[PDB]
Amino acid sequence: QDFDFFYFVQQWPASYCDTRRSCCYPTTGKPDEDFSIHGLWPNYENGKWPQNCDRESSLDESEISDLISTMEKNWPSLACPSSDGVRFWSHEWLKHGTCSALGERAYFQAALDFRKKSNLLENLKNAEITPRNGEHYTLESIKKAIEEGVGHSPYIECNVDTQGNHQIYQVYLCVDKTATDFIDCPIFPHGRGCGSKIEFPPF
Ligand SMILES: Nc1ncnc2c1ncn2[C@@H]1O[C@H](COP(=O)(O)O)[C@@H](O)[C@H]1O
C-alpha cells in the first residue's frame, strides 16, 4: 500500500531483437521503429518495490478495448512465440499495475501518455542522434538530448548485440506517485551504467 514514485521504462525494440535472445514480432506485424513501453513500475526510494498487489485482479480487456490497437504498436511483446501482447500486458498489470493505485484503464493510458510526452525518438533526432550500426554515439549526447525534451535526466540501460557492441536498450524516467508529471529520479536503477560510446541500432 502506497509507494514513492514510478519508473517509466521504455525500450528500443531493435536492441531486444539483435541479441542472442529469441525475438518474435507481434501477431500485428513488425513494430514501429520507435521506442516502446516496457512498463510503469511503482517503486520505493530505498530501491525496493511493491509487486503482485492483487493476485486476484486479472486483466479486463474490455476496460482498455479502444486502447488495444495503440498498445499493440506502442507496447508490443517481442517474446516468442509471436503473441498479441495481451499476455505481456496482463503480466505488467498484475505485477505492477495492481500496485499503482490506478484503475486498469488509467494505468495503461498513463503509460501511453508518458511515452508520447517523453517523445524520445524525436528528441534524439533533434540532436542528430539517429539509428545506425556501431557504437557511434556518446552516452552524454544521448542523455542531454533526452533531458532537453523532457526536462529531467533519464537513466540509460545498455545491453550487447551479437556483434559485441554496447547499445542503448532501455530508458528510465521517473513519474510522480500520482502519475501526473515526470520528476527527477530520487534514485537510479541498480545495474551497471553504459559505456562512453554506444550503438543506436536500426531494425
Ligand atoms: N520497480 C522496479 N525497479 C527496478 N527494477 C525492477 C522493478 N520492477 C522490476 N524490476 C526488474 O527489471 C525487470 C522488469 O521485469 P518486469 O517486472 O517483468 O517488467 C525484471 O528483470 C526485474 O528484476
Ligand SMILES: Nc1ncnc2c1ncn2[C@@H]1O[C@H](COP(=O)(O)O)[C@@H](O)[C@H]1O
Ligand atoms: N519487448 C518485450 N516483449 C516481451 N517480453 C519482454 C520485452 N522486453 C522484455 N521482456 C522480457 O521481460 C524480462 C525483463 O528482463 P530484461 O531482459 O532485463 O528487460 C526478460 O525475461 C525479457 O525476455
